[PDB]
Amino acid sequence: SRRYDSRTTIFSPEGRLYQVEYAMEAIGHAGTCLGILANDGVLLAAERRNIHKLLDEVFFSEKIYKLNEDMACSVAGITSDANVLTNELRLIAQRYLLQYQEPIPCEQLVTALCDIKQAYTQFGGKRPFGVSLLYIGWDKHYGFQLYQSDPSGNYGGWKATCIGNNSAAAVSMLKQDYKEGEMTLKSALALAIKVLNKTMDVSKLSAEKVEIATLTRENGKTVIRVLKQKEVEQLIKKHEEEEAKAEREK
Amino acid sequence: NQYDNDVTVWSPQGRIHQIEYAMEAVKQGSATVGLKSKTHAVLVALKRAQSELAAHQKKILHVDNHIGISIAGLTADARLLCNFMRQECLDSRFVFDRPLPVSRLVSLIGSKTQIPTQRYGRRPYGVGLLIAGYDDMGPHIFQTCPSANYFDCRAMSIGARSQSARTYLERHMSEFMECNLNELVKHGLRALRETLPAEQDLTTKNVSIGIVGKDLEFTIYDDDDVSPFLEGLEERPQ
């Protein structure tokens, strides 16, 4: 019995533990997602992968999931574990609401899920979860918020982040061009369009190959909208014409 | 040799090796002898100490007023088995209100020690119990082993360098059938002195004695009252 074991919990002579490292190498491929916020409303942009000619296009959502009245999250990596994790945190939020009769703050929910995710890396002898995902939300404590998770277990707040295969270039371009406390929910969309244009190899940015979700605040609604395909095309062509004009200036 | 790391693996010759290694382990302890007459059972043990400033290790244990044991091996498992024996004998005394016959007790020990030699990741017990008792049929001497295989014998000796004692006991077997305790103990001591080098023999600090009889409770003698028994022995011939 000890001959067939794989020992998926022990350390290594060099200090690190291999399984979480291999999972992070696995999350490298398979998708591209990013999130940005600077004022009322926060936006998530995702790169659709299944773009074959024969898809029925149901469920009104591809990679964006709703977790509460004011919580949404994307995901990258193996999709089945994504289904598991989303279902797992949904009832966490609901049981908090049942006990306290108050919407759950984002930070506590993220910490709870991260604790569950880390439990598998210390004891049990099971394969870890190969999924990393973002969180966007709003609450009365700190307004609007964005956070990022990790198969290792840790997390952290952010202002603009990317997770997909070309995350390095996206992060460099983001830190090169951003302003603190001025970007309204009109310039952030253009910034995301330009970043996606740079990262993906396919030019002309076919509107069916991207997905955009935005969160905005109302008197008592906190409406989440998934803007349709009838509004992406003019945004893209506006980006194209302004880029052509700027290049022609030089 | 991959046929050496578990008690579940069978060798191509049909010999499990962990049991053989436990039988090897039991030979590292000090020697001990046991024998029986018509109406008594006597066992003798030779002690050992590490440094001259340490007390000698105790080898004879008291199980019950009509049952005594002598150990050889490692002490922890010996204590565990001795505790189990105490418990079983007391339970029998409580329920049926009668002493437990030696044979049934030995059978219980045999059935208990056999269990670990079949599961996964379990080791046998390393002990060399010699059991001396008195019952309705008279005296009784028994010997066990780590392989859960008990033997019924009328004279035995085990431990390190036990072969010479066995030779002496075998060639003087008949004389045990008539003599009383006074020279029976002398015969046991003569047998035990055979398994030592030619420098030191018996000084009252390395020898213990245990007697059970028809009308005598299980009694232990050590280091002070052994002198009456130790005197009267001729010097070792050269």
Binding site: - | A25, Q28, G29, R48, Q50, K59, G73, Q163, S164
Partner: protein
């Protein structure tokens, strides 16, 4: 037609071959398997048939093949690379025995210590006909072995061989020999004139060669 003898190493096989060669009158050829492996293709089979052809001429000759497991290894199928030259000399050996024309005049003996290796077509009843097997000596034989090899040494009359044989079980023949030379030298260190019982008792612990640890805390 012929005899094989097999069993664990250190039992008296090659000793029997030497004895038989010492008693008989016939021509005796002595050979060992690995000696037939040769570099140039076809050079080994020539040696095989030339040895049988020599023995045929010396009318009553007998032939002894030691270390047979160096040739008889089981054939196999392979598609990249494999071994074939030795297989091809074996297929000549398997044909000087039995084969297309019977030879009835030469006696074949062969010896090995492992049999699970050998090719079944070699073990066939027509070629190797009696398959003798050699067991490890039981208690009474060890006394006799020790009592033979100490025939020429000066030893005192107080030795009890049926004690020594009794505390040395799971030895084979070679070790029961070696006890006697160890017990000689142990006595020689102290300048003593003849061997005594304790010198044998120490020789036992020499030949056991068990690793050391104190284990004094036992008992």
């Amino acid at each position: 037609k012929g005899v094989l003898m097999y069993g664990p190493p250190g039992t008296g096989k090659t000793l029997l071959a030497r004895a038989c060669a010492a008693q008989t009158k016939a021509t005796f050829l002595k050979l060992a398997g690995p000696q037939l492996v040769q570099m140039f293709i076809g050079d080994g089979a020539k040696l095989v048939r030339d040895a049988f052809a020599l023995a045929k001429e010396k009318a009553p000759s007998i032939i002894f093949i030691d270390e047979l497991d160096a040739i008889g290894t089981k054939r196999f199928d392979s598609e990249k690379a494999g071994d074939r030259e030795v297989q091809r000399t074996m297929l000549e050996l398997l044909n000087q025995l039995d084969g297309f024309q019977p030879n009835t005049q030469v006696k074949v003996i062969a010896a090995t210590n492992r049999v699970d290796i050998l090719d079944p077509a070699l073990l066939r009843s027509g070629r190797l006909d009696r398959k003798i097997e050699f067991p490890m000596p039981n208690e009474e034989a060890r006394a006799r072995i020790m009592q033979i090899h100490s025939r020429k040494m000066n030893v005192s009359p107080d030795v009890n061989y049926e004690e020594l044989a009794r505390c040395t079980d799971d030895f084979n023949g070679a070790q029961c020999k070696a006890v006697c030379v160890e017990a000689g030298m142990i006595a020689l260190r102290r300048g003593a004139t003849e061997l005594t019982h304790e010198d044998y008792m120490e020789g036992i612990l020499e030949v056991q060669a068990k690793k050391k640890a104190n284990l004094q805390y036992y008992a």
